[PDB]
Amino acid sequence: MTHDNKLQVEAIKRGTVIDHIPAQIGFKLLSLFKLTETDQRITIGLNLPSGEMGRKDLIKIENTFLSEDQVDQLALYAPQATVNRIDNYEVVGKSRPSLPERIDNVLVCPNSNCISHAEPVSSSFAVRKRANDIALKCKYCEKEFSHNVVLAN
Template sequence: MTKETQLQVEAIKNGSVIDHIPANVGIKVLKLFKMHKTNQRVTVGLNLPSSALGAKDLIKIENTFISEDQANQLALYAPKATVNQIENYEVVKKLTLSLPEQINAIFKCPNTNCITHGEPVDSSFSVLTKKDDVQLKCKYCEKVFSREIVTEHN
């Protein structure tokens, strides 16, 4: 680290750092994506000062590499997040997120009558984007929900 300022959360040797998560969304991301369900060390920083976001959350998972596809699943919650891959203390890859075409097995369908609630099937939404407006269409009940409705229910 050649930075003048000290890191707010200790550097890691190998693994993934999810940076620039909006403040208050870090815990949600951690739980929703089951990032805490690992034997690896996970460090979390909440409400860290950030010049770009004012305040941000940050998650570091050691010895675990998040693929591009997995990273993009985060885009609905944290579109400005960056996923850094760390090897031997160096940032070797920096992924910026883009919305995927499908989001599977993460969000519950907001429609309480949807078959996905009673059956052991994974949820599946196709992502529809019109300019900045993002909507999700459930594969099972075919209802369309705004991004806000889906994130509020999850």
């Protein structure tokens, strides 16, 4: 017993699908971790009730397996969303994000006085899970902010 959901999707023979993505996060993930330089079939389902009965976002992608490190980097945007690896309509191994030990090269120290705001340096933050929140700490500025205040691209 493999594929049997009474909902419409567009399976990708040999590809990567990331489901259960919170509203306004699907677009965010395809507009952040840049999932567009791909002359390969990507299907963008936004605000769809495919997984469960809530408003989710689905990113079907052909042969673009994001390593266990590029998936963890999603745990900061859609910690619930699972990510399914599929082998020719014949699915394989599933998974669901794990808070990175760090998030280098993507975010930005919100610190106006931080040094990485003036020199050729790749941004970096040790990821720390806390109570009702995640704490990001520059390797440079050394201060620490809430993932909701750290903007990035």
